[PDB]
Design an enzyme around this catalytic site. Structure first.
Site, PDB file in Angstrom:
ATOM      1  CD  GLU A   1     -24.525  -2.371 -20.397  1.00 44.19           C
ATOM      2  OE1 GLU A   1     -23.517  -2.567 -19.678  1.00 44.19           O
ATOM      3  OE2 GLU A   1     -24.524  -2.406 -21.656  1.00 44.19           O
TER       4      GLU A   1
ATOM      5  CD  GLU B   1     -12.119 -12.573  15.242  1.00 42.62           C
ATOM      6  OE1 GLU B   1     -12.283 -13.775  14.923  1.00 42.62           O
ATOM      7  OE2 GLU B   1     -10.994 -12.062  15.457  1.00 42.62           O
TER       8      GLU B   1
END
Ligand SMILES: Nc1nc2c(ncn2[C@@H]2O[C@H](COP(=O)(O)OP(=O)(O)OP(=O)(O)O)[C@@H](O)[C@H]2O)c(=O)[nH]1
Ligand SMILES: Nc1nc2c(ncn2[C@@H]2O[C@H](COP(=O)(O)OP(=O)(O)OP(=O)(O)O)[C@@H](O)[C@H]2O)c(=O)[nH]1
Ligand SMILES: Nc1nc2c(ncn2[C@@H]2O[C@H](COP(=O)(O)OP(=O)(O)OP(=O)(O)O)[C@@H](O)[C@H]2O)c(=O)[nH]1
Ligand SMILES: COc1cc(C(=O)c2nc(-c3ccc(C)c(O)c3)ccc2F)cc(OC)c1OC
Ligand SMILES: COc1cc(C(=O)c2nc(-c3ccc(C)c(O)c3)ccc2F)cc(OC)c1OC
Ligand SMILES: Nc1nc2c(ncn2[C@@H]2O[C@H](COP(=O)(O)OP(=O)(O)O)[C@@H](O)[C@H]2O)c(=O)[nH]1
Ligand SMILES: [Mg+2]
Lengths: 431, 428, 125, 425, 426
Positions: E63, E246
């Site tokens: 859009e 991590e």
């Protein structure tokens, strides 16, 4: 529907035909020369119904004059308006019918009838829209009755789609002493039941009684009687001759007046009753005209209308009068005399007004009834016939000309059959 | 576009056509020569190159004297000669002569003229046929014409304006015969027939116009006003228009039940010494005095009401007027008709022939209602038919022209069934 | 609390704070074509549904033509039945009217033959 | 999801359609010569949803005007904003539909429909991204009703993936033009059930009752009724027309309002109600769920809302608006279905409608709308059991079967609405 | 270098992207024109031959209104047109439209733009995907993309930031459907998803900022501060969560249970004394400061990290941790140690100037993986069930070519997920 072709046969037929032509000629402004001398366009608007337009701005009655006796042709040419008729339309033999129906119908009349059809075709083919034929004749003689009905048959064969109309004069012992007149009248009525659409019943008995009882003429002549005839003929052809909103013709009259083909014999009536050539010192009112019209003293057939019921009625009032007043009286006479109208033909009385009165009157009324009371006329003829036929009186006058008793028996049966039909519908109920 | 062809048969149909086409020329400013100093009037008038406006109409009569007056009257140049068709002999008040004997000799001429008028239409709506029930031409030639129109134009709309016979102003004793006969043979071929009772018009001209002995021109001029109210929607730019299709859809619940009842108001003497409200004239439509057919709607049931207003009439005033009507218990609608009102409003006021008897009014209304009460008029005719037909009175004149007796009882049975149809549709 | 250093960097420092050791030692216990097959399958279902919609609208179109055609057929049948009805009654009325005129001229012609027998019976005498 | 193509058909369609264009042109500041004279750019941000931008900086409505009768559009063209329409977007026949659905749908409609579709097909290709179609028509007549549903069907065949939305005016005997309104409407509702995505039920019975009972108008006219229709149409298109954080469009509306494909008939509502010529947030909230403000003659307390979309226009505390909408949902909890959580969505737009400072507009998908269809069905049955007026439809080629099926389908629609009204969790 | 690529799908993903890239630019001294007067910021910004630093980002919204908000915005010069992918017709709040109808149409275009970003990387860590649960684009296209990123980047980490629907600031009645559909399809393909509950964020702004009706800007600004704190050690040379893997090492012991709870403090009103380390540390254990609404008293922790930012001394953190251990019960699962990983990032917290968030000396973000977060899934499953029992709205999804069976198969997976959270929180 415009042109009518007029035929008059025999002494009586030519005598009342002449009078007819004098009377309407004066109403239409035509003099014995055939020239128009009137003052109103109304006189000419429908003038072609009875008159051909001749070269020279003249008017010739569309009239054919027939008789086995030569003498009556000379009598007419001498009479007033004898010079109006087309000379070629006189068709005369040399010996009368001797008051013998068979002579007019089978022998002498048969030898002259093609001469008649010459003139009838010539008049008929000239017409733009031929209404049909009107015949004046008597039923008691030999020519008007015998040759007159033969003529009807013959004309009907070539013009079967036109209206056939007769003014038929009924014999009475009060007026003529010829004892075989019931024979001639019965034979002729046979022919008219089968071959005409409308017949005005003009009864010498009625005419004599009116002249003697009402006009107070001790010894009425044929001229006294024919003044009643001509007043009637003027009145019952008024709507044919003058422009109205009704635009009447012979066929519309038949369709509405004749519910059953055989029952086509009308009882005419007239008011006021007058003597010929006599000043009228007071007019008649519209209620007077209405009442005196349905009164047996004013009928041209010796029948009391109160002895029967009217099938249909057509009335014409002449003169300047309130059509509102005419509508009122005519409606009242039907409401108060309700039992003299068959209830199973709704609204069976038609009224017209013509602002032009006949000569000599300021107002008048003429009445054409189809009443079952006309059986009285046919019962009277039938009784006279039988009184003679039981004895076979005078039958050799007829068998000498080739006829057979059976023809008499049949015409008597057919007339008694006609009396029963009148009676059948006179007693018929709506329930 | 949207053209209507008018056909006028016999004396009654032609003379009414005179009142109508006179009124139409005056409504649209057409002069009797067809010239003219909103184009909708083109549905009823074609136009020639010279700007002449010719009515889309045929005049037929079997005898010439009535139409000859047109040919020599005021509007003798309004019509083309070919539109005025006459024979030489009328039907002598005899259905059988109008339909067969006499009528067959001119029927092909009439359809050729009609076909020529159809060819001048880009969107033909239908035919309007004006005739009497009673005349031999009015009945018999119209039956023939209607049958031939169905063959030529299929189911194209055909509406009648029929003059129902009255003894007061009548012509013939055989009119009940001609009426039943033409109604039978015509039933299948007409979509909608507006009947007019000469007795009802006669009585209106007496009571409302103080005319002692009303003439045909009196009757016809009033009749023209009713006709004009109906066609005004098709001849004018109006706010609420009703076309020929809309008349049929809204007024005819069943093919046979197609005889709506007309009512007109106000009818005011031109010599009377207060302009009636939209409500007053609306209520006048449900009074039996202003009905064009004598019958009693309060003793029947309405199946549809079409209200045609003209003049100074505002929609809020119609809506208020009609809402009152929907609350009168004497005005009963059938159970199977949830909504029975259709309203049209044309704004040009009614027009009156100068030197006529009807007064100029600022607003008028014509109601067309389909009521079961119209059956009363059919019952009146059938009874007169039965009186004579039980004795076979006059039938011989019809048989002589080639008809058969079976046609009479088959036509009388169709009116029996028609009467039983009006009973059935009125049940719940 | 057992603190344990983790790392030390330019913009930061990190360590580990331990409050309790775990109660429990240890820890308990589409390809590219598959994807495109599934996307393609959904497209064919989309397209199949669109095709069935257009099929039902096409069925409406045909009914509309069939209605229009039925009305034209009814109008044609109305014409055909009005034509045969009208010709039937016009020929029947003609035959009737002609048969009447023939009967009426027949009866008059019998009268004509009878007149000939009357005229012959006369010369017989 | 930009452009909507608007179509109006028949007398009623063209009268409320023209009043619609008249009204929104006032809001977007477009005068009748297509020229813009507004005071805010908010009016022009999404003006291409309904208007084309003609050369000369003039805005032309994306409107197509259809009728089988020339009278109505002649009157439109002479109307106040009559000049604003493209002159070749008028498509009109000559011989009318005769108040007959069969005529509009089969015979006369077919002869004019492809001329309409050509003007639709040209407006569509001038669109960056065609959002869908909005049709205005009545259901009781012949043109809007019969030809309008033929239009929808044919438009669906040509653009199956575009939203179809109708403003459909319901007939009532209180404001009738023709006796066969129950036929025309029943045959059309069959069509709408099948072929539309959203229909706003505009009920002439409701509009008459609002004018008579609430606005005290003793004798309502079409002008009175159409004032309520124009307020309603302006209200349910506000979000399509003005920039908001919702970025509303027809497809998003359909998705959240239509839980079941057949149940797509909306009950519109508006507050405050006003008569021609002649207010708090808590009242707007309540008056919107009140039967005296429904444009369908249906009592929402007679059923349950499946979904509701509400829009508030004017400067007002969106906190207070949201507070009151929540209070209304909890107090009236037994008139929302328990099995569609959070089924009321509220939008605000700062710009009030002309003449007002605060308005609210309501779009409800209520099972109570079955009352509207039961009313049409009873009137239908009353006529069709006697086969009254049927011959004007069989004459057009229709089978009686079409009549019975179209009513079986509308009675099924009523049943379906009932089934979800009695559904529980 | 450890490059991360940011992908923003649907209106919510894009408008929060704006809020994040604006705050990153402020944090790194990148002016709106891209120019700039520690090199860790290159993990999120590339550099052009003109000296301009350009976000490693691709925006996707079918859009154009929302992406034109970037083409024309204040930071518009930061982006190249090829990073902004749009279309004409959005998903109409319909997962099926987003996933099947549009997704099949633009997936190759989008994947190609991501490949141009990835070809510029010497050591791409993976992707940070921002999207709503509720939108049809956010739900439908994102789940198709994650499927495809698992195919084209098999070992790369994918982190989501997912906007969880709130009725208080919702859009659509069908967001529960789209939420369960996208969660089902993405579950296999995401290593760690940080959910943001719009109702949680709405409540923090009302209560802590004195805003009666927060806008998307209010919410997005606050959301940026959270994302900033989660990414601050990727964009600066920090010491905890210094690369994407991590995050799953420290927060995701079980692969399906990868929805950590993020808690942020302090949130202080701009128009309204600096808080201590102990005060903000206490706030991490108040559920009124969680990004997702759930009650941690109802679950056990699996992992818990404290990301401090600004003027924070380890001495003060350890003492803050010791105080709550004595007063409060903090229940971890049996197989996991009861404790925290702590990181301090010296870079001070930053607010948008003129915004509604006041600048603070020090802030903290706690990321905890508690089984309590399964209450959030329970809320969505109930609304899903309420509607799906009656098949409400399902026909809009079937119409786009999705099979009805996907609804139930997705819902079964969510049922399995709740049972998984029960199993580990025994
Ligand atoms: N009213 C009236 N009746 C007449 C007149 N002349 C004769 N009659 C009657 O007519 C019947 C006699 O018939 P006529 O006309 O004299 O006989 P015809 O037709 O000429 O037949 P023939 O003389 O035998 O050749 C008798 O009843 C007479 O009373 C007349 O001028 N007026
Ligand atoms: N309203 C009205 N009725 C008329 C008019 N003229 C005749 N009538 C009625 O029409 C019926 C008579 O039939 P007409 O129409 O005159 O006869 P026609 O159609 O010309 O047929 P024929 O003359 O028999 O060949 C009677 O009931 C008259 O009252 C008229 O001008 N106006
Ligand atoms: N926090 C936050 N949430 C948002 C924002 N924008 C939308 N949302 C939420 O996201 C959900 C709506 O989905 P969106 O992502 O906006 O829509 P979309 O993905 O573009 O998909 P479609 O428009 O349906 O094609 C609703 O729950 C919104 O409240 C935003 O800027 N910030
Ligand atoms: C020639 O003498 C006349 C002829 C006619 C008709 O030709 C004519 N008659 C009718 C008519 C007749 C009788 C009844 C019971 C009826 O209902 C209608 C209708 C139309 C006509 F043209 C009329 C006359 O006066 C009424 C005449 O003078 C008495
Ligand atoms: C055309 O007029 C409108 C359109 C929309 C939407 O187009 C739109 N609607 C929704 C929506 C609708 C209903 C429910 C129960 C829901 O949960 C969400 C969502 C997104 C939208 F863009 C919205 C409106 O007001 C809310 C409108 O005016 C009343
Ligand atoms: N509300 C409203 N209804 C109307 C209007 N005009 C006509 N109607 C209704 O429309 C129906 C008649 O159909 P109409 O549109 O006039 O026929 P069409 O032109 O053939 O489509 C009736 O139910 C009337 O109530 C109007 O202006 N406003
Ligand atoms: Mg005549």
């Amino acid at each position: 529907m415009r042109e009518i072709v007029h035929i008059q046969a025999g002494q009586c037929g030519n005598q009342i035909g002449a009078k007819f032509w004098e009377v309407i000629s004066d109403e239409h402004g035509i003099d014995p020369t055939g020239s128009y001398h009137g003052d109103s366009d109304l006189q000419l608007e429908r003038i072609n119904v009875y008159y051909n337009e001749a070269t020279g701005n003249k008017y010739v009655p569309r009239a054919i004059l027939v008789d086995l006796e030569p003498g009556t042709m000379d009598s007419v040419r001498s009479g007033p308006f004898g010079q109006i008729f087309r000379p070629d339309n006189f068709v005369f033999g040399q010996s009368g019918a001797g008051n013998n129906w068979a002579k007019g119908h089978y022998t002498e009349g048969a030898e002259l009838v093609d001469s008649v059809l010459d003139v009838v075709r010539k008049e008929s083919e000239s017409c733009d829209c031929l209404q049909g034929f009107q015949l004046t004749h008597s039923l008691g003689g030999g020519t008007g009755s015998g040759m007159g009905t033969l003529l009807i048959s013959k004309i009907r064969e070539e013009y079967p789609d036109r209206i056939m109309n007769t003014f038929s004069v009924m014999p009475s012992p009060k007026v003529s002493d010829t004892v075989v007149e019931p024979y001639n009248a019965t034979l002729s009525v046979h022919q008219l039941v089968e071959n005409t659409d409308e017949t005005y019943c003009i009864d010498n008995e009625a005419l004599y009684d009116i002249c003697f009882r009402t006009l107070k003429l001790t010894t009425p002549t044929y001229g006294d009687l024919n003044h009643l005839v001509s007043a009637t003929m003027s009145g019952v052809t008024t709507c044919l001759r003058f422009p109205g909103q009704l635009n009447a013709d012979l066929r519309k009259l038949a369709v509405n007046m004749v519910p059953f083909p055989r029952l086509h014999f009308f009882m005419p009536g007239f008011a006021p009753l007058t003597s010929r050539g006599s000043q009228q010192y007071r007019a008649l009112t519209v209620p007077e005209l209405t009442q005196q019209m349905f009164d047996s003293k004013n009928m041209m057939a010796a029948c009391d209308p109160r002895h029967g019921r009217y099938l249909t009625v057509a009335a014409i009032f002449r003169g300047r009068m309130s059509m509102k007043e005419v509508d009122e009286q005519m409606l009242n006479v039907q409401n108060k005399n309700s039992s003299y109208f068959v209830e199973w033909i709704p609204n069976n009385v038609k009224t017209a007004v013509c602002d032009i009165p006949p000569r000599g009157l300021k107002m008048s009324a003429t009445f054409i009834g189809n009443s079952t009371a006309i059986q009285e006329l046919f019962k009277r003829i039938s009784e006279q016939f039988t009184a003679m036929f039981r004895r076979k009186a005078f039958l050799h006058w007829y068998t000498g000309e080739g006829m057979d008793e059976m023809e008499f028996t049949e015409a008597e049966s057919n007339m008694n059959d006609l009396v029963s039909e009148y009676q059948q519908y006179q007693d018929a109920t709506a329930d | 576009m949207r053209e209507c062809i008018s056909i006028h048969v016999g004396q009654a149909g032609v003379q009414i056509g005179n009142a109508c086409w006179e009124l139409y020329c005056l409504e649209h400013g057409i002069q009797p020569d067809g010239q003219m100093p909103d184009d909708s009037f083109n549905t009823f008038f074609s136009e020639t190159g010279a700007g002449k406006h010719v009515p889309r109409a045929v005049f037929v009569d079997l005898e010439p004297t009535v139409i000859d007056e047109v040919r020599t009257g005021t509007y003798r140049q309004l019509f083309h000669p070919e539109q005025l068709i006459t024979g030489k002999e009328d039907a002598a008040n005899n259905y059988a002569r109008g339909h067969y004997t006499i009528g067959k000799e001119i029927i092909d001429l009439v359809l050729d003229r009609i076909r020529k008028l159809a060819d001048q239409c880009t969107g033909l709506q239908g035919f309007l046929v004006f005739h009497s029930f009673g005349g031999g031409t009015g009945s018999g030639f119209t039956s023939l014409l209607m049958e031939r129109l169905s063959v030529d134009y299929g189911k194209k709309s055909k509406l009648e304006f029929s003059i129902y016979p009255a003894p007061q102003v009548s012509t013939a004793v055989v009119e009940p015969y001609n009426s039943i006969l033409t109604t039978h043979t015509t039933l299948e071929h007409s979509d909608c027939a507006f009947m007019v009772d000469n007795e009802a018009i006669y009585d209106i001209c007496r009571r409302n116009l103080d005319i002692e002995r009303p003439t045909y021109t009196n009757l016809n001029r009033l009749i023209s006003q009713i006709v004009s109210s109906i066609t005004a929607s098709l001849r004018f730019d109006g706010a609420l228009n009703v076309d020929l299709t809309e008349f049929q859809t809204n007024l005819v619940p069943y093919p046979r039940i197609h005889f709506p009842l007309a009512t007109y108001a106000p009818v005011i003497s031109a010599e009377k010494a207060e302009q009636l409200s939209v409500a007053e004239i609306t209520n006048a439509c449900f009074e039996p005095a202003n009905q064009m057919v004598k019958c009693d709607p309060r003793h029947g049931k309405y199946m549809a009401c079409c209200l045609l207003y003209r003049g100074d009439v505002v929609p809020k005033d119609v809506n208020a007027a009609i809402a009152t009507i929907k609350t009168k218990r004497s005005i009963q609608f059938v159970d199977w008709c949830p909504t029975g009102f259709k309203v049209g409003i044309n704004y040009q006021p009614p027009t009156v022939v100068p030197g006529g008897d009807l007064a100029k009014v600022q607003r008028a209304v014509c109601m067309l209602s389909n009521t079961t009460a119209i059956a009363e008029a059919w019952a009146r005719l059938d009874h007169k038919f039965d009186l004579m037909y039980a004795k076979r009175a006059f039938v011989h004149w019809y048989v002589g022209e080639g008809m058969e007796e079976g046609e009479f009882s088959e036509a009388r049975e169709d009116m029996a069934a028609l009467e039983k149809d009006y009973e059935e549709v009125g049940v719940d | 609390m057992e603190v344990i250093e983790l790392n030390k960097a330019t913009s930061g420092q990190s360590w580990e704070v331990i409050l309790k050791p775990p109660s429990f030692d240890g820890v308990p216990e589409p390809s590219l074509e598959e994807i495109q097959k599934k996307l393609e399958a959904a497209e064919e279902r989309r397209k199949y549904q669109e095709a069935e919609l257009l099929k039902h609208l096409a069925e409406k179109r045909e009914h509309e033509r069939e209605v229009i055609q039925k009305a034209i057929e009814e109008n044609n049948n109305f014409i055909k039945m009005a034509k045969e009805k009208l010709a039937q009654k016009m020929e029947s009325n003609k035959e009737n009217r002609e048969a009447h005129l023939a009967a009426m001229l027949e009866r008059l012609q019998e009268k004509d033959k009878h007149a000939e027998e009357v005229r012959k019976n006369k010369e017989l005498k």
